[PDB]
Amino acid sequence: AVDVDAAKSLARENNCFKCHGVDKEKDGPSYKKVAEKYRGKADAEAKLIHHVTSGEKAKFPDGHEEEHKNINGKASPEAIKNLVDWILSLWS
Ligand code: HEC
């Protein structure tokens, strides 16, 4: 079961909410929209764990790109999984 407080704590600590809201878009997509994009995908969790631990290109609204925030080695595997699992749940 997702630990919601631990997920939101990890997000705060790693600047995630500076660019993402739960329901409101900012620099990055809302997590509700992400959850919708990935709803049902069998490999959703692995894909988002990959996304947050690789630093691949992230295209911004104004057209510029940056390597995405990479938290590999900055928290535990269990904490990262729990944060992904929280995100994926936010479609409802
Ligand atoms: C602003 C500087 C950002 C910070 C800090 C973080 N994210 Fe981000 N993220 C951002 C952008 C601009 C995008 C869109 C990239 C694109 O090319 O479309 C994203 C995307 C995500 C996603 C969706 C990935 C996908 O496969 O659809 C997730 C789940 C996500 N970002 C999570 C996330 C987390 C957990 C962060 C803190 C560790 C974080 N982001 C920081 C911009 C920014």
In short:
Helices cover 49% and strands 7% of the residues. It is mainly α and 92 residues long.
Q: Can you offer a commentary on this structure?
A:
By secondary structure, the chain is mostly helical. The chain has a single domain (1-92), classed as Cytochrome Bc1 Complex, Chain D, domain 2, CATH 1.10.760. Helices cover 49% and strands 7% of the residues. It has 5 helices and 2 strands, in the order ααααββα. The chain has helices at residues 4-13, 16-19, 31-38, 44-54, 77-88, and strands at 57-59, 65-67. It has a two-stranded antiparallel sheet with strand order 1-2. A hairpin with a 5-residue loop joins strand 1 (57-59) and strand 2. It is globular, with a radius of gyration of 12 Å. The two termini are 16 Å apart. 14% of the residues are buried. The protein binds heme C. Heme C (HEC) binds next to helix 2, helix 3, helix 4, strand 1 and helix 5. Heme C binds at residues 11, 14-16, 18-20, 27-29, 34, 37, 48, 51-52, 58-60, 68-69, 71, 83, 87. Residues 2-90 form the Cytochrome c domain. Heme c binds at residues 16, 19-20, 37-38, 59, 68. This is Cytochrome c class I. One of its GO terms (molecular function) is heme binding. Keywords: Electron transport, Heme, Iron, Metal-binding, Signal, Transport.
